[PDB]
């Protein structure tokens, strides 16, 4: 009869200084940390790739 | 007596297929051809230069 010890979850910090435990939920509750403005993309491939 | 000839202004093109002889006027009235979303800039310099 050996003994087990349990360790609590660490939590990861998001915008507004708000701590959640799951990445998805607190990206959908407070969003990312830094403030970009938009992502300009380049695409290299065939016509179907662009489609 | 020597004879001169006149040549008319060429005109330039802007958004919505509108023509003008000046770039400042046509940019203030109509706007540019393509659609950017925003300029993300990198600034390398001293602190006072950044300010």
Nearest CA in chain B to A36: B40
Cβ distance B37 to A37 less than 8 Å, yes or no, reads: yes
Residue spans of alpha helices (H) in A9-46: 23-27
Q: How many Å apart are CA B28 and CA B32, to the nearest integer?
A: 9
Best interface-test mutation with B: which of A36, A38, A41 has the largest number of B CBs within 10 A? A38
Those of residues 1-51 in A touching chain B at CB distance below 8 A are 36-38, 40
Resolution of this PDB entry, in A? 3.0
Phi, psi of B44 (to 5 degrees): -110, 120
Residue B30 vs residues A3, B5, B23, B27: alpha-carbon distances, Å = 76, 33, 10, 6
Provide the total of helices (H) and of strands (E) in chain A, helices listed first: 2, 2
Residue pair B40/A37 in contact by the 8 Å Cβ criterion = yes
For residue A22, CA distances in Å to A16, A17, A25 come to: 16, 15, 6
Interface contact flag, B37 A36, Cβ < 8 Å: no
């Amino acid at each position: 009869m050996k003994e087990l010890i349990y360790i609590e979850e660490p939590k990861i910090l998001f915008a507004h200084g708000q701590k959640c435990t799951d990445a998805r939920d607190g990206l959908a509750l407070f969003g990312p940390l830094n403030n970009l403005y938009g992502i300009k993309s380049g695409v290299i491939g065939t016509k179907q790739g662009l489609k």
